[PDB]
């Protein structure tokens, strides 16, 4: 059995720690909703 | 129960302690996460009940207490937030610009940061902090690095 605690606001942080990369992907989704590389 | 917009852990105690299985969204009374996270189950808020309302496994997408509300999209071009709440660990910001998820049905927002499966749910935020879509549905890349779609919902 499964519950809920909150854990913070929905807010834009103004100087928050940037990172990560900008990749362009060819996927496929199945029917079971999981992506997959098509390559 | 709590029905105060904002971020939630969503947590179970069918294993070893309490374990964090996923994140989601409350707004305007529905909270909203990933299906893989609830598999369509009910959720508890203290000693309030959620019920599920709308879910689609192809979408990986689950609404509780009504209708999908979170009708914000990428717009393309602009950096946008991650707001992860990683297991055991406060809610952080982290600022990103989306990579492309290209398919023969259209192209998706992707954010390429690596958290653990228990952050899927967590919201992707625009600069006027509208969430434009939820993190936890995406692929391990040559790499071996994990890259999440911005997996969105349609509004009615
Ligand atoms: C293997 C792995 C690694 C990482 C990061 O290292 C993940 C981060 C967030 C979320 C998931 C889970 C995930 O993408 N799906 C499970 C179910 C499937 C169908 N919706 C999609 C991660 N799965």
Redesign the pocket.
Known sequence: DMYIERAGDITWEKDAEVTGNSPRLDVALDE????SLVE | GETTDGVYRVMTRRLLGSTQVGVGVMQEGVFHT???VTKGAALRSGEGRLDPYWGDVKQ?LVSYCGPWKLDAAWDGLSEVQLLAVPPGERAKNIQTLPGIFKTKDGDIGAVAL????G??GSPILDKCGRVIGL??????IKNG??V?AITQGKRE
């Open positions: 079971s909703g999981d992506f | 990933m299906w893989h990986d690596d958290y653990p499966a952050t899927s993190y936890g549905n995406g692929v391990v690095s994990y999440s």
